[PDB]
Amino acid sequence: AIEFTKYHGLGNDFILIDNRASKTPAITPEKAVEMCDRHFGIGADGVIFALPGENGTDYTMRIFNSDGSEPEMCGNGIRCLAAFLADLEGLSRNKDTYRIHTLAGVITPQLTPDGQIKVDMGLPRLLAGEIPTNIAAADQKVINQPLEVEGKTWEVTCVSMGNPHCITFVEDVAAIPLETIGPKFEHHPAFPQRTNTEFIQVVSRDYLKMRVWERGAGITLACGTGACASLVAAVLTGRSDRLATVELPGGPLEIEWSEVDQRIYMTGPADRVFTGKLH
C-alpha cells in the first residue's frame, strides 16, 4: 500500500516517501531493507522520508541505508529530497531554498535556475572524536595517518560531514579492488560506528576522481557527503584547491570549501525516475 517515488542523484538511488503526516517514519528499518533489495523489492541504496519540520526548519529528512542502519546525513539524498519537496509543493512553493532538519544539523539545499541543487552542507568536522575514529586522540585531527588493512598500511585522512569518512589517495582509482577491500575499511576496528571509505585519484588541483565503499550500502555510483569529505581531505593534505569537480562513477559533483564561511557547498543533479505503489 506504500506509495513512493524513485529518485537518483548521480545514480545513488533512493526510495522517497511522503511522510508529512507524522514524525514517525512510515516503515521500519527492517521493511526498508526489504524495499531496498534490488531483486525482491524496489531496489535502492536507501529510503528517504520527507518528514515534518522541527522548530525553525521547513521539513526533516531521515534516511535508512539499504542495510537498515540510519546515517546522520546524505548529500545525494538531500538533493533528491529537495526535488521531491518541490514536486510535493507544486505551485504552492514560494521559495527556492529549504531548511531541512537532519540528525547532523540543519542542511539548506537551494534549487538553482539551471535545475541543479546547491547544498549548504555545513562545517566539516575534523577531530578524531567527531568522526569517530581511534586512529588519533579525540581532540586531534586525522591527516595522512596510518591504517593497517589486511596487512597493507594505507595512508588515510578522516573527515565527518555528520557521517564518517576515511579518505585515501591513490594513483589509479579504477584499479582499486573495491569489492574486496571496501568492507575491510568499513568494519575496521579503528571506526567504532563504521566508516564510509573513499579512494581518490587527484587528476589536477581542481579535479578529483572518486570511488566509494559506503557504510551500510556498499559500492554506490556516487556519494555527496563522501565527495565533500574527500575535497576537505585533499585540501588538508595540500593536494587540491578548495573548489573542485569530484568525478564519481555516476557523474560529477561541484564541491566548494568556502573561504567566506568555511562551510562545504555541494552542487549536483537530482532525477525523478518513476512513481510506484507496493503490492
| Site residues (vs ligand ZDR, CB under 6 A) | 12, 65, 71, 74-77, 163, 196, 214-217, 220, 223-226
Cell of residue 258, nine digits? 568556502
- Let me know: does 268 contact 79? Beta carbons within 8 Å: yes
The DSSP code sequence of 134-198 is SSS-TTSB-SSEEEEETTEEEEEEEEESSSEEEEEE-S-GGGS-HHHHHHHHHT-TT-TT--EEE
When binding is defined by CB under 8 A, the residue of 27, 80, 156, 221 that contacts a copy of itself is: 221
274 contacts a copy of itself (rule: CB under 8 A): yes
DSSP 37: -
* 133 or 196: CB nearest ligand ZDR: 196
* 124 or 269: CB nearest a copy of itself: 269
Active site residue 223: yes
When binding is defined by CB under 8 A, the residue of 6, 79, 188, 209 that contacts a copy of itself is: 6
175 contacts a copy of itself (rule: CB under 8 A): no
Task: Give me the catalytic one of 36, 74, 166, 228.
Answer: 74
* 203 or 278: CB nearest a copy of itself: 278
Task: Give me the catalytic one of 36, 158, 166, 223.
Answer: 223
Cα–Cα separations (whole angstroms), residue 273 to 42, 63, 84, 151, 270:
12, 19, 11, 43, 10
The residue to which cell 575496521 is assigned: 188
Residue 154 beta carbon to a copy of itself: minimum distance, rounded to whole angstroms: 25
Residue 156 beta carbon to ligand ZDR: minimum distance, rounded to whole angstroms: 16
Choose from ligand ZDR, a copy of itself, none: what does 221 bind? Cβ within 5-8 Å by kind: a copy of itself
Residue 65 has φ and ψ, to the nearest 5°, of -65, 165
**Residue 128: CB atoms within 10 Å:** 21
Nearest CA-CA partner of 59 in 28, 87, 29, 101: 101
* 224-236 helix and 75-89 helix, angle to the nearest 10 degrees: 140
189 contacts a copy of itself (rule: CB under 8 A): no
Candidates 17-25, 121-129, 208-216, 270-278; binding stretch for a copy of itself (CB under 8 A): 270-278
**Residue 70: CB atoms within 10 Å:** 15
Active site residue 158: no
* 25 or 250: CB nearest a copy of itself: 250
Choose from ligand ZDR, a copy of itself, none: what does 118 bind? Cβ within 5-8 Å by kind: none
- Let me know: does 185 contact 175? Beta carbons within 8 Å: no
Choose from ligand ZDR, a copy of itself, none: what does 216 bind? Cβ within 5-8 Å by kind: ligand ZDR
List the beta bridge partners of residue 49.
17, 62
Q: Which helix (H) or strand (E) holds 236?
A: helix 224-236
Candidates 37-45, 126-134, 138-146, 168-176; binding stretch for a copy of itself (CB under 8 A): 37-45
When binding is defined by CB under 8 A, the residue of 21, 24, 40, 139 that contacts a copy of itself is: 40
- Report the interface residues with a copy of itself, using CB under 8 A: 6, 8, 11-13, 38-43, 221, 250, 271-279
Q: What are the catalytic residues?
A: 74, 223
